[PDB]
Design a protein around this ligand. Structure first.
Ligand SMILES: Oc1cnc(-c2ccccc2)nc1
Ligand SMILES: [Zn+2]
Length: 140
């Protein structure tokens, strides 16, 4: 579990998005594992506008923050899971790190603010759904 709260927006893994999230759907990309919903509250999170390839992600399955090198957002193939089929996920960044299914929504972040949320995992890798190209999160 984990959500980015910026402006009047809640960002989630789409595979963990609630009936409420869908009722107030702003934008969804099945291929990015990303949903964004409208909120009534403003958010205090800031979205990194940068091309950092080093960050800190929260691993709930370790209750630890891990510094990581990560790849540039790409169209990468993702193996079978349980919350998804074996599929191609876009705007996805891989780092060598621990990621279980329940670590999804773990925030990845650099000095510039939030970079992404944990989306994929296993084979000793962690996949993050990039959100830094979504410029529209930073107004209204
Ligand atoms: O996977 C589910 C997520 N959301 C909904 C949903 C249905 C009607 C209105 C709002 C939400 N259903 C199923
Ligand atoms: Zn950055």
């Amino acid at each position: 579990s984990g959500a980015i709260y910026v402006g009047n927006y809640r960002v989630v893994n789409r595979h963990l998005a609630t009936h409420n999230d869908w009722a107030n759907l702003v934008w969804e990309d099945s291929s990015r594992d990303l949903l964004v919903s409208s909120t009534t509250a403003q958010g205090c999170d800031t979205i990194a506008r940068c091309d950092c390839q080093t960050g800190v992600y929260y691993c709930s399955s370790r209750r630890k923050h891990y510094p990581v090198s990560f790849s540039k957002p790409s169209l990468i193939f993702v193996e079978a899971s349980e919350y998804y089929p074996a599929r191609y996920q876009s705007h996805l960044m891989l780092a060598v790190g621990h990621s279980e299914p329940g670590d999804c929504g773990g925030i990845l972040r650099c000095q510039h603010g939030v970079v992404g949320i944990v989306s994929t995992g296993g084979n000793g890798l962690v996949g993050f759904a990039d959100v830094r190209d979504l410029l529209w999160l930073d107004e209204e």
